Amino acid sequence: MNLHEYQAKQLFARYGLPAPVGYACTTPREAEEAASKIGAGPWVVKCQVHAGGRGKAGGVKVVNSKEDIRAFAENWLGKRLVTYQTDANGQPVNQILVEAATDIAKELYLGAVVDRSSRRVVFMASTEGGVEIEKVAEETPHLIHKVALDPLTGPMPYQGRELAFKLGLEGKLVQQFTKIFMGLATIFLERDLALIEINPLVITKQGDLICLDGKLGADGNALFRQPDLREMRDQSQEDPREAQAAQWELNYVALDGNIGCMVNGAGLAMGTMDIVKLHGGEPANFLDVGGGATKERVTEAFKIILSDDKVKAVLVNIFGGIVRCDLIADGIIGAVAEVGVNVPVVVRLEGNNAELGAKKLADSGLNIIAAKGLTDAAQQVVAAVEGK
Amino acid sequence: MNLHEYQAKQLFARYGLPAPVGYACTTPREAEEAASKIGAGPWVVKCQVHAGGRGKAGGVKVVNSKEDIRAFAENWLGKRLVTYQTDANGQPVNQILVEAATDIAKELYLGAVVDRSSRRVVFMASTEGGVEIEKVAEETPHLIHKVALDPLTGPMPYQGRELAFKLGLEGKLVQQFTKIFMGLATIFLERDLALIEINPLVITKQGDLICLDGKLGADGNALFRQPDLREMRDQSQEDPREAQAAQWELNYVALDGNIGCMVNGAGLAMGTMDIVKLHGGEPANFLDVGGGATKERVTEAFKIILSDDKVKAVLVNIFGGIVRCDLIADGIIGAVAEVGVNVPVVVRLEGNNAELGAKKLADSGLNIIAAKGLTDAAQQVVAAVEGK
Amino acid sequence: SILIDKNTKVICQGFTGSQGTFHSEQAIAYGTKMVGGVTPGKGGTTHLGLPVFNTVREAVAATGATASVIYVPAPFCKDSILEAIDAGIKLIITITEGIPTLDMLTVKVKLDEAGVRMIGPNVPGVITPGECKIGIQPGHIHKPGKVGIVSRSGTLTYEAVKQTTDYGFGQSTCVGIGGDPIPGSNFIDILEMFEKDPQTEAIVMIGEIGGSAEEEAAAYIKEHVTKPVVGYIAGVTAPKGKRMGHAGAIIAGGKGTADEKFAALEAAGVKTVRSLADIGEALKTVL
Amino acid sequence: SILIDKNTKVICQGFTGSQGTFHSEQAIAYGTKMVGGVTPGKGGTTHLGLPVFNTVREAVAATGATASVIYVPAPFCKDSILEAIDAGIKLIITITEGIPTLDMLTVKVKLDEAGVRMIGPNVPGVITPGECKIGIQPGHIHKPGKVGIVSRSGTLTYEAVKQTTDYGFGQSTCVGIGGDPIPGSNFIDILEMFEKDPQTEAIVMIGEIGGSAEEEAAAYIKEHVTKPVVGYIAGVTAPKGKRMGHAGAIIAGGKGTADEKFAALEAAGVKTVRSLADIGEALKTVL
Ligand SMILES: CC(C)(COP(=O)(O)OP(=O)(O)OC[C@H]1O[C@@H](n2cnc3c(N)ncnc32)[C@H](O)[C@@H]1OP(=O)(O)O)[C@@H](O)C(=O)NCCC(=O)NCCS
Ligand SMILES: CC(C)(COP(=O)(O)OP(=O)(O)OC[C@H]1O[C@@H](n2cnc3c(N)ncnc32)[C@H](O)[C@@H]1OP(=O)(O)O)[C@@H](O)C(=O)NCCC(=O)NCCS
């Protein structure tokens, strides 16, 4: 799960890591009243949303009057900021972070993730701050530097210095940097983070390192032992459906398309979508039942897939599972009738008595086709939509 | 450095580990007034000294009246408790620990140290509580159980359970034990301890695990990063001379003998003593100059060795060093005159111009012999004392 | 075949739990040599007609088992896996889903260092048709054979498993290496096995978007694998951004795309198939 | 000879400090190939006529050195040793005294795992008479020869070193493994070396009370060493209880006594000597 910028800076603070002085506000009054608590302007107002590119979108501004702060807060709180990292529908702004302006001398990049290839936590540092690192990697690689934490010894200082010297830092800035490396590396391990991204790590005109902007990504799987990160989850930041699909042990994700896919197994799901859009067709989504596919799960699954209206036909593909294909076919029927499914459904049962199951779907009456085989079920779902 | 029992229980507490309710008192009034703060008797009074065997020595008693507590405190505070683990001169009692009596059902043993052989921190558990484990090892080995912490993963729960099951524990006691294992193992690592010894780890009539008595040994070398343990050092518990020898970068330790040995190098020191007591002779002590053997170090070294009066002759054996043998010989002379050494000294210089040095000691006049060779210097120091 | 066989003796950690029970029965009925299980606090009892122990060491000593299968909830796996490693077990199959990535990061180093092999976590298991079955894969869609299967996906494996059984090719051994960011074994581990295995005449490699395990397997295949390999990558229609079911499922940095992997596999000499339905055909070809 | 020689190229960590400076000069004057040193923040300067770098990696890349000697204060060794291990250095000689035992516990595992050899900590160093000298041992009391020396003690080594030079036996190589509870190398490590070394005709093993490294060496000697070994254990007059200079110096548990070790060595076929003065004689005998 992702944390808001302000939440990350809070953590950073907690670990003795420099961040601009500021406050997260939930109303224009709070926003403007924060200007004084901070000091003299100009001040920086930033919408708090999980996606990036907030700058380009005008979700970040530097002002010089309580009037502007007030105006800015007034304009965004409640609205939804849409950046190049948000879906075309953007994300709600429920807090405006108001902090002090920083005298930027140079912008650096510091970040960490779990390198799947080297199977270690890797910290990256670059002199290319304020830039898409993804890009820096592409164009100028030799400007990115890495180190891997040793699971046996923990983050060591010589590593922070190595990066500091690569960045050409010297004097106190080297020690300062080494501290931030040790600090971040510790948060990463102790808080079970999946990613850290200090972009930019600023060197001020005054000559000090400060984290002007930070993005933290936590490891969902570790949340049971991360009570604090657990409480910082901001539901309003991700697609709602995905959220309920979750408590309902489903796994939703939407796409454009017109054909709804309901498969059990993330692999088979992508494979199903792939095969559908191979026979023409257009995958309207990715829904991984979860296997424990019971009748309720199937009824909920149908609701979520059909909560969207671009869906013209639903393709069910259940291979294996904990329930016998006949009981699975019933859940498909009972759900189609209850949720009052109003679309042609093409099922593809597999496993125990998929025979009897396939039949239960033919005699049901409901516009529930019962394809024979993956390849087939494809063509038929593709067919049932052609024209609409 | 060692910690008092009360200091250890404090730490244990800090880590959520069960210990009797009690208080460390420095005056009879405090002692007796603590009885009420605790609850109803009987209560347990225990002298606080670093050595063990306090029980046998009568330094621990179970009382049933404020009058006794008062009496007991009154009798020990200021006195020196002498046990089989203290030198025949005992150790000062400056605190009396007063805690609640415990309903002991069974006594177990839990302890940990750094096994030099396996190069790991090893925890030992046994059902032989209240007994010298050293003994249990000798007689009944199969009753001792061990586990080693993995430097890579840290203390794991399955390890605490392994020990718990060996001890025949079951039910809540297993989980309880596992907790104490995890707790102790953490203190050991986080606080850089060299040893932990919960003897006995008690199972109460009420059916719970509690640390009736604990002994913690910290790693001196890590004290720079152990500010708290650093402040708990109780100077009054170890021989005073050794203490000053320390700030004076010397390394003292006394024995019976009559011949004082002053060597540079712990190895050469024991080797010197060994060779002296090989040619008859009697090593009165072990003093490792430290090599940086300057004139002041030598003058201080002579004071400490001669702060004792069983010393009839001093044997100096300086091989190598940072100062040229002639300058070393001067320090020997200047010290013998200043400290007014009143004993026959037999030096054995080696290294740079040990020639000129050896001479400076002959023409000095002082009763400073200048032996030629290890073997020789021995016989001569042995000789210079024979008769006194 | 690789990893297991008729002789492999297995103990189950988390044996008295819902899933440990249910599947141990299935493995039992398939004829897998289940010699017992472990559940702290239940040692001394018998379950599914087998001894239940408190510690893995007790079980190993008592049964001489060498492989352990884990059905312990995520919050406790690091403790189960590390215990099994320490008890002497040489093959661990962790079915569990949800282990913190940092946990597996450490365990992976341990496993390596201790010379212990682990399939998983987050996997259906491993199966040698006719001989041994450790996991949750449908035993009825398999058939002793000549094709080896490795898959980052669970269900997809089944599609392939059925196809090879349907073309009467049979399976030498099926291995689900799993999804998770840092797994016990990767493609290159299992591939090097199928290569050195006589009974395996051809290989089916199933991957998906995310990471670069496949890209790395590709280079290995090209430089070390000789037997024919048919490959399939899912998630061509998957969009950048969200994680598709698994965490390693996201296609980030403009890398780890399905097409990227396909090409690399192709350039490595691997018979790729665009539709998961033609895996059987592809084999029929190369065989 | 073992460990080092005329060709060994050395870098010094903590090169610009008092001791790093003083002794680097001594090693320099002895003809040891000091190619540079490392001191964070002083990279780019030259010291004792040699390049000073900020990181070990820079130095290794710049000089191709393979051995590093450490003169860094205890509070920072774990960081120096781990850096050197990671920079590719294959031989580390840590002169430092005072490293927390838990630090060396971890480092020891690392060293092993990474195939890196370390003499120390808390040692005088290593010296191959006439060829290479890394440490603080007196170069003037040595003499190229046929006897190899291993010692848990610093100064004692010198007594032995002088005696062998005085009987015109000469030293193949001198190694102080150190006192500290968990050292980089133990007797068995160095012994196995002297054994496989042609130039070494006889061995002198110096130990002391505490632990059981000697007892373990004894069993090794008896089962694997063929060359003659003269042994000496100090601390026969040492009393149980206090630590004699070193932490590993205490004779606890009624074990690790001097006499205990003597016997074991004797039973192993080692020529023991009761007086450190007769080490030369003992050699004269066996040689
Ligand atoms: C592992 C998993 C199956 C467990 O589910 P489960 O069986 O319902 O869990 P239960 O609580 O019923 O059983 C767990 C058992 O673990 C045991 N246990 C706990 N810690 C243990 C340990 N360290 N060692 C051994 N057993 C342990 C307990 O015995 C418990 O059962 P019991 O106390 O009732 O006897 C579940 O967490 C999971 O990961 N599911 C997803 C698996 C998956 O999808 N894999 C992908 C394949 S495609
Ligand atoms: C190691 C020891 C010699 C250091 O003593 P020292 O030279 O006086 O210490 P100094 O402060 O003068 O020098 C240490 C240098 O380490 C350097 N340093 C610190 N951390 C460093 C690191 N990680 N890497 C490299 N150099 C580092 C500094 O450069 C410092 O010198 P500088 O900053 O002045 O240039 C001392 O701590 C010690 O252990 N003495 C006992 C040794 C012993 O008795 N051994 C037994 C043999 S028998």
B21-104 classified as CATH 3.90.1150.10: no
Contact predicate A325/A347, CB 8 Å = no
Closest C-alpha to A355, from A384, A329, A331, A388: A329
Partner D contacted by A179 (CB < 8 A): no
Partner C contacted by A88 (CB < 8 A): no
- Measured in Å, residue C67 CA sits from the centre of ligand 1 at 17
Contact predicate B178/B199, CB 8 Å = no
CA distance B382 to B276: 7
| Three-class secondary structure of residue B254 per DSSP | strand
CA distance A197 to chain D (A): 25
Contact predicate D179/D122, CB 8 Å = yes
Task: Indicate which ligand has the atom closest to the C-alpha of A249.
Answer: 1
Partner A contacted by C277 (CB < 8 A): yes
Contact predicate C184/C190, CB 8 Å = no
Residue the block writes with tokens 């995310």: C210
Kindly list the strands in the beta sheet with C171-176, ordered across the sheet, starting from the edge strand earlier in the chain.
Answer: C132-135, C125-128, C171-176, C144-151, C202-208, C229-234, C271-272
Closest C-alpha to C89, from C65, C113, C106: C65
Fold type of domain B1-20+105-239: D-amino Acid Aminotransferase; Chain A, domain 1 (3.30.470)
Resolution of the deposited coordinates, in angstroms? 3.0
β pairing state of D33-38 and D50-53? parallel
Tokens of A32: 């403007």
Please name the member of B220, B251, B375 whose beta carbon is closest to the beta carbon of D277.
B375
D32 annotated among ligand-binding-site residues: no
CA distance B354 to B360: 10
CA distance A282 to A381: 10
CA distance C113 to C99: 20
Tokens of B50: 């670093």
Amino acid identity of residue C164, one-letter, is: T
Element (H, E) at A36: helix A28-38
Element (H, E) at A11: helix A5-14
A332, A377, C261, D207 from A275: Cα distances, Å: 22, 10, 17, 74
CA distance B214 to C99: 37
D97 annotated among ligand-binding-site residues: yes
Contact D71 CB / ligand 2 (< 6 Å): yes
Tokens of B182: 């995890």
Element (H, E) at B350: strand B345-350
Residue-range domain boundaries for chain A:
1-20+105-239, 21-104, 240-388
Partner B contacted by D242 (CB < 8 A): yes
Contact C80 CB / ligand 1 (< 6 Å): yes
CA distance D144 to D160: 14
D95 annotated among ligand-binding-site residues: yes
Neighbours of chain A (3+ CB pairs under 8 A): B, C, D
β pairing state of D9-13 and C271-272? unpaired
User: Taking CB atoms and an 8 Å cutoff, what residues of chain A touch D55?
Assistant: 158, 161-162, 165
Residue A317 pairs in a beta bridge with A263, A348
CA distance A23 to A99: 6
Partner C contacted by A144 (CB < 8 A): no
Query: Atom of ligand 1 at shortest distance to CA of C71?
Result: 1
3-state secondary structure chain C: CCCCCCCCEEEEECCCCHHHHHHHHHHHHCCCEEEEEECCCCCCCEECCEEEECCHHHHHHHHCCCEEEECCCHHHHHHHHHHHHHCCCCEEEECCCCCCHHHHHHHHHHHHHCCCEEECCCCCEEEECCCEEEECCCHHHCCEEEEEEEECCCHHHHHHHHHHHHCCCCEEEEEECCCCCCCCCCHHHHHHHHHHCCCCCEEEEEEECCCCHHHHHHHHHHHHCCCCEEEEEECCCCCCCCCCCCHHHCCCCCCCCHHHHHHHHHHCCCEECCCHHHHHHHHHHHC
CA distance A385 to A387: 6
CATH of A240-388, one of 3.30.565.10, 3.40.50.261, 3.30.2350.10, 3.40.50.10320: 3.40.50.261
CA distance B21 to B91: 25
Closest C-alpha to D118, from D56, D173, D177, D53: D177
Method: X-ray
| Three-class secondary structure of residue A160 per DSSP | helix
Q: Which residues of C are annotated as a binding site?
A: 16-19, 42, 95-97, 158
D79-114 burial, b at 16+ Cβ within 10 Å, e below that, comes to bbbbbbbbbbbebbbbbbbebbbbbbbbbbbbbeee
Q: Delineate the domains of chain C, giving CATH numbers in brackets.
A: 1-122 (3.40.50.720), 123-287 (3.40.50.261)
Ligand 1 mutation target, pool C85, C96, C159, most atoms within 8 A of CB: C96
Catalytic residue among A5, A32, A109, A128: A109
Task: Indicate which ligand has the atom closest to the C-alpha of C19.
Answer: 1
Contact predicate D5/D132, CB 8 Å = yes
User: Taking CB atoms and an 8 Å cutoff, what residues of chain A touch D80?
Assistant: 158
- Mark which residues 140-199 of C lie under 8 Å from B by CB: none
The number of residues making up chain A comes to 388
Ligand 2 mutation target, pool D15, D19, D92, most atoms within 8 A of CB: D19
CA distance C270 to chain B (A): 39
Nearest-5° angle of CA A313, CA A318, CA A321? 150
Element (H, E) at B61: strand B60-63
CA distance B147 to chain C (A): 11
CA distance C264 to A349: 34
Q: Which residues contact D150 (CB under 8 A, 6 or more apart)?
A: D175, D177, D187, D190, D191, D194, D203, D204, D205, D206
Contact predicate D94/D118, CB 8 Å = yes
| Helix runs in chain D, H state only | 18-29, 56-63, 77-86, 101-113, 155-166, 187-196, 213-224, 258-267, 279-286
B274, B283, B380, C166, D237 from B286: Cα distances, Å: 11, 8, 18, 85, 10
The DSSP 8-state label assigned to residue B58 in this structure reads T
A58 annotated among ligand-binding-site residues: no
Size of interface B-C (CB pairs under 8 A): 34
Q: Write out the DSSP string of B369-382.
A: EE-SSHHHHHHHHH
- Measured in Å, residue C37 CA sits from the centre of ligand 1 at 12
CA distance D282 to D144: 19
CA distance B346 to B352: 19
What would you report as the CA-atom Rg of chain D, rounded to the nearest whole angstrom?
Answer: 18
Tokens of A221: 């799987």
Closest C-alpha to A295, from A241, A249, A334: A334
The DSSP 8-state label assigned to residue D45 in this structure reads -
Contact between chains at B161 and C78 (C-beta distance less than 8 A): no
Closest C-alpha to A176, from A22, A10, A8, A17: A17
Segments of chain A assigned E as strands: 22-25, 43-47, 60-63, 80-81, 91-92, 96-100, 104-115, 120-126, 144-148, 193-204, 209-211, 214-218, 252-254, 259-263, 285-287, 313-319, 345-350, 368-370
CA distance D60 to chain B (A): 28
D158 annotated among ligand-binding-site residues: yes
Nearest-5° angle of CA B85, CA B89, CA B94? 85
Q: Write out the DSSP string of B42-57.
A: -EEEEE--SSS-TTTT
Catalytic residues of B, by residue number, are 109, 197
